[PDB]
C-alpha cells in the first residue's frame, strides 16, 4: 500500500487567516491524490481531485497543490464554516488509501 | 439530483450479521464503482471495498476480506454490504461511495450508516 500522511493531526488557525495543511506520499503518486472535508455529523465533501483540480461547485478559496510524493492543500481564507477534519487520499494504485487527518481549529 | 440513500442505524449484538443497503439514483447506476468505508469514531478514512455493477466483481481492502461481503442489485439500483462475526470492534461509521473508474476520486457518499455491536 501507499501512506498516505498528514503529519499533523490538528492545525490552528484564525478566521481571514491563511492555512495549508500537508500531505506526504510513501511513494511518486504523480498528481493522483485527492482532498475531502468531512463536517461534523456531515459525510467526506470531495473538494479535490487530481492533486490540485476543483470539484464541481467548489468555492474560489480552497486551492491545492503538490506533485510525486509532497502534497499540500490550502484555504485562503478561513471561514467559520470551514470548520472540518481533512483528509488527502491518493488515487495512484490498489488499494486506494487516506491520510491521517489533520482536524483544524 | 443524484443521491446515495443508506439504511438505518442498527443496533446489533455481537456475532451476529447485518446487510447495510445503500439505493443510488440520479446517474446511470452501472457506470460507476460502488465504494465503502469504515470509520471507527473519530478516526481516519479506511476504504473496505468497491463492487462492479455490470457484472458484481468486487475487490477488497485485504483487511475486510472475510468481514465484508459487497453485492449489488441493478434492477433497484442498491449496493449492499453484509459484515459477519460482529463485535465492537467493527461498531463503527460506514460510508457507500461511488467513483469514477478515470479520474479516479470518491465524488458522492451516503449520509451514513452507524453500526453498534453490543
Known amino acids: 500500500?501507499?501512506?498516505?500522511?498528514?503529519?499533523?493531526?490538528?492545525?490552528?488557525?484564525?478566521?481571514?487567516?491563511?492555512?495549508?495543511?500537508?500531505?506526504?506520499?510513501?511513494?511518486?503518486?504523480?498528481?493522483?491524490?485527492?482532498?475531502?472535508?468531512?463536517?461534523?455529523?456531515?459525510?467526506?465533501?470531495?473538494?479535490?481531485?487530481?492533486?490540485?483540480?476543483?470539484?464541481?461547485?467548489?468555492?474560489?478559496?480552497?486551492?491545492?497543490?503538490?506533485?510525486?510524493?509532497?502534497?499540500?492543500?490550502?484555504?485562503?481564507?478561513?471561514?467559520?464554516?470551514?470548520?472540518?477534519?481533512?483528509?488527502?487520499?491518493?488515487?495512484?494504485?490498489?488499494?486506494?488509501?487516506?491520510?491521517?487527518?489533520?482536524?483544524?481549529? | 439530483?443524484?443521491?446515495?440513500?443508506?439504511?438505518?442505524?442498527?443496533?446489533?449484538?455481537?456475532?451476529?450479521?447485518?446487510?447495510?443497503?445503500?439505493?443510488?439514483?440520479?446517474?446511470?447506476?452501472?457506470?460507476?464503482?460502488?465504494?465503502?468505508?469504515?470509520?471507527?469514531?473519530?478516526?481516519?478514512?479506511?476504504?473496505?471495498?468497491?463492487?462492479?455493477?455490470?457484472?458484481?466483481?468486487?475487490?477488497?481492502?485485504?483487511?475486510?476480506?472475510?468481514?465484508?461481503?459487497?453485492?449489488?442489485?441493478?434492477?433497484?439500483?442498491?449496493?449492499?454490504?453484509?459484515?459477519?462475526?460482529?463485535?465492537?470492534?467493527?461498531?463503527?461509521?460506514?460510508?457507500?461511495?461511488?467513483?469514477?473508474?478515470?479520474?479516479?476520486?470518491?465524488?458522492?457518499?451516503?449520509?451514513?450508516?452507524?453500526?453498534?455491536?453490543?
Open positions: 461511495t461511488r467513483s469514477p473508474v478515470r479520474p479516479y476520486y470518491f465524488d458522492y
Open positions: 487530481s492533486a490540485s
Open positions: 463492487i462492479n455493477p455490470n457484472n458484481g466483481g468486487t
